[PDB]
Design a protein around this ligand. Structure first.
Ligand SMILES: C[C@H](NCc1cc(C(=N)N)ccc1O)C(=O)O
Ligand SMILES: [Ca+2]
Ligand SMILES: [Mg+2]
Length: 223
């Protein structure tokens, strides 16, 4: 997260860190056994880490659970990043409490101007590499479809939306990928891509979760 602030220990209970000997992507807990992340975050040997703040120190409240299976959307296109969504089933159900809780799926899509909370342990520098120890937060609004498409001509599909600031200085970044975009208590987006980080006229692009609610439910029900 670039230009954000320190969230505060366990203030974002649904945030998860995907770990393979190091933090490589974020994710969101949607129930005791399932996590939603980005399809481009797929890899074998994933350990899901819940209840984290400082990802380099065991502070208490952490729960490390292995992924039993990862389900990348069948129509995911790695060239366009269309359908950039993946479901991860936990080997064992997580113990839900005040520090580890699930986030609700949306019943309807969010409108432009809606304020959302984006979080993650991704890079905090627009020019260079600097990964934080603790979870970072950023309040950002969903942009109009017209501004999004004007910023990324011919690269925005119906399954994506832009959020952020056109002036630059505030944005999600590498490492935040797969993480949550929560608006009014609902998971509306997944950190997907963007041109660089916090660059002017280049807002972040996110997977539009409201288009996948039926797919998520049907997939979870059959697995
Ligand atoms: C570098 C490029 N990722 C870019 C990227 C950009 C943003 C953003 N500006 N909001 C968020 C997450 C990302 O993963 C890539 O993975 O190829
Ligand atoms: Ca920790
Ligand atoms: Mg990336």
């Amino acid at each position: 997260i670039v230009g954000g602030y320190t969230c505060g220990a366990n203030t974002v209970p649904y945030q998860v860190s995907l770990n393979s000997g190091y933090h490589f992507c974020g994710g969101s807990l949607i129930n005791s056994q399932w996590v939603v992340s980005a399809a481009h975050c797929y890899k074998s040997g994933i350990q899901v880490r819940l209840g984290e703040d400082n990802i380099n120190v065991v502070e208490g409240n952490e729960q490390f659970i292995s992924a039993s299976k990862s389900i990348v959307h069948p129509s995911y296109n790695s060239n366009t990043l269309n359908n950039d969504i993946m479901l991860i089933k936990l080997k064992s159900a997580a113990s839900l409490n005040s520090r580890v809780a699930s986030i609700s799926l949306p019943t309807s899509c969010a409108s432009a101007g809606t304020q959302c909370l984006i979080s993650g342990w991704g890079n905090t520098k627009s020019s260079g590499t600097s990964y934080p120890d603790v979870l970072k937060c950023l309040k950002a609004p969903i942009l109009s479809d017209s501004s999004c498409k004007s910023a990324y001509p011919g690269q925005i599909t119906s399954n994506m939306f832009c959020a952020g600031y056109l002036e630059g200085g505030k944005d999600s970044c590498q490492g935040d990928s797969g993480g949550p975009v929560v608006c009014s208590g609902k998971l509306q987006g997944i950190v997907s891509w963007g041109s660089g980080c916090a660059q002017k006229n280049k807002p972040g692009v996110y997977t539009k979760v409201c288009n996948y609610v039926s797919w998520i439910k049907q997939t979870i029900a059959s697995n």
